[PDB]
Coordinates of C-alpha atoms in Angstrom, one line a residue:
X5 CA 11.6 -13.4 -0.7
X6 CA 11.6 -10.0 1.6
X7 CA 13.7 -9.7 5.1
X8 CA 13.7 -6.6 7.2
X9 CA 16.1 -5.7 9.6
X10 CA 17.0 -2.4 11.7
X11 CA 14.1 -2.0 14.3
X12 CA 14.0 -1.7 18.0
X13 CA 14.2 1.2 20.9
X14 CA 14.3 5.1 20.2
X15 CA 14.0 8.6 21.4
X16 CA 11.4 10.5 20.6
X17 CA 12.7 13.0 18.0
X18 CA 15.3 10.7 17.0
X19 CA 16.2 8.8 13.6
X20 CA 15.9 5.1 12.8
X21 CA 17.1 3.5 9.6
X22 CA 15.3 -0.2 8.5
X23 CA 16.5 -1.9 5.8
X24 CA 14.4 -4.7 3.9
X25 CA 16.3 -7.0 1.3
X26 CA 14.8 -9.1 -1.5
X27 CA 15.9 -12.3 -3.7
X28 CA 18.4 -10.7 -6.4
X29 CA 17.0 -11.7 -9.4
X30 CA 13.8 -9.8 -8.9
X31 CA 14.9 -7.0 -7.8
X32 CA 14.4 -4.6 -11.4
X33 CA 10.7 -6.5 -11.9
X34 CA 9.1 -4.9 -7.9
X35 CA 8.2 -1.6 -6.5
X36 CA 9.1 -2.2 -2.9
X37 CA 6.4 -0.7 0.0
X38 CA 6.4 -0.3 3.4
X39 CA 3.2 -0.6 5.6
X40 CA 3.1 -0.2 9.2
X41 CA 1.3 -1.2 12.1
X42 CA 0.5 0.1 15.3
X43 CA -1.3 -0.9 18.6
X44 CA -4.1 -2.4 17.4
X45 CA -5.1 -0.1 14.4
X46 CA -5.3 -1.4 10.9
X47 CA -2.3 -1.7 9.0
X48 CA -1.2 1.2 6.6
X49 CA 0.9 2.6 3.6
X50 CA 4.2 4.4 4.8
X51 CA 5.9 4.8 2.1
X52 CA 7.1 3.5 -1.8
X53 CA 9.8 3.5 -4.4
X54 CA 9.1 3.0 -7.8
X55 CA 10.7 0.0 -9.8
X56 CA 10.1 2.6 -13.0
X57 CA 11.9 5.8 -12.2
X58 CA 13.1 5.4 -8.7
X59 CA 10.2 7.6 -7.6
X60 CA 9.0 8.2 -3.9
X61 CA 5.8 8.5 -2.3
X62 CA 5.1 8.7 1.4
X63 CA 2.1 8.7 3.9
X64 CA 0.9 11.9 4.7
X65 CA 1.5 10.9 7.9
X66 CA 5.4 11.0 7.7
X67 CA 5.8 13.2 4.3
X68 CA 9.1 15.1 5.0
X69 CA 10.0 13.2 7.6
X70 CA 10.9 9.6 6.4
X71 CA 12.4 9.1 3.0
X72 CA 13.8 5.8 0.7
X73 CA 16.6 4.5 -0.9
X74 CA 18.0 1.7 -2.7
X75 CA 21.2 -0.3 -3.1
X76 CA 21.0 -2.3 -6.1
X77 CA 24.5 -4.0 -5.5
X78 CA 22.7 -4.9 -2.0
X79 CA 19.3 -5.5 -3.3
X80 CA 18.6 -3.8 -0.7
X81 CA 15.5 -0.5 0.2
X82 CA 15.9 1.7 3.3
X83 CA 13.5 3.6 5.0
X84 CA 15.3 6.4 7.0
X85 CA 12.9 7.9 9.7
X86 CA 13.9 11.3 11.1
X87 CA 12.4 13.4 14.4
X88 CA 10.2 10.0 15.4
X89 CA 6.9 11.0 16.7
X90 CA 5.2 8.3 19.4
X91 CA 2.7 8.2 17.1
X92 CA 5.0 6.3 14.9
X93 CA 5.4 2.9 17.3
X94 CA 4.4 0.1 15.5
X95 CA 5.4 -3.5 13.2
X96 CA 7.4 -1.6 9.7
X97 CA 6.6 -4.5 7.3
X98 CA 8.3 -4.1 3.7
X99 CA 6.4 -5.7 0.3
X100 CA 6.9 -6.1 -3.2
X101 CA 4.1 -5.1 -5.8
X102 CA 4.7 -5.5 -9.5
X103 CA 3.1 -2.2 -10.5
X104 CA 5.3 1.3 -11.6
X105 CA 2.5 3.8 -10.8
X106 CA 2.5 5.9 -7.8
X107 CA -1.4 5.2 -7.4
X108 CA -0.6 1.4 -7.3
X109 CA 2.5 2.0 -4.6
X110 CA 0.2 3.4 -1.8
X111 CA -2.5 0.3 -2.3
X112 CA -2.0 -2.3 1.0
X113 CA -4.1 -4.1 -1.8
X114 CA -1.6 -4.0 -4.6
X115 CA 1.4 -5.9 -2.9
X116 CA 2.2 -9.7 -3.6
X117 CA 5.3 -9.9 -1.5
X118 CA 5.8 -9.5 2.4
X119 CA 8.4 -9.4 4.7
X120 CA 8.1 -10.7 8.6
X121 CA 7.7 -7.2 9.6
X122 CA 10.6 -5.2 12.5
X123 CA 9.5 -3.5 15.6
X124 CA 9.9 0.1 15.9
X125 CA 9.1 1.5 19.4
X126 CA 9.9 4.9 19.9
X127 CA 9.3 6.4 24.0

């Protein structure tokens, strides 16, 4: 079970942090990813954190601006967004995959559990 929080309206060039909380007993058996859907576009990969070694991976559009962190105590993952662009406006979904490999983390087809999504609107 996955629940996102922290969406909303933010100015262009600003920062925003969204979070995703899991079940608790399943925290250490699944890598966590973020996917987004912009108005009218296909949902796409954003970022992921590997359960194997806590290394993180980013889509070309966000690399350097967006970062993912983990708080194991709260069974929560965070997507920090810096220098937001109008093109970043989208519904952000968190998802869980049992794979640890970077090559699996960037693939929508390989995730088994999905959140409900949180809207991020960049003015």
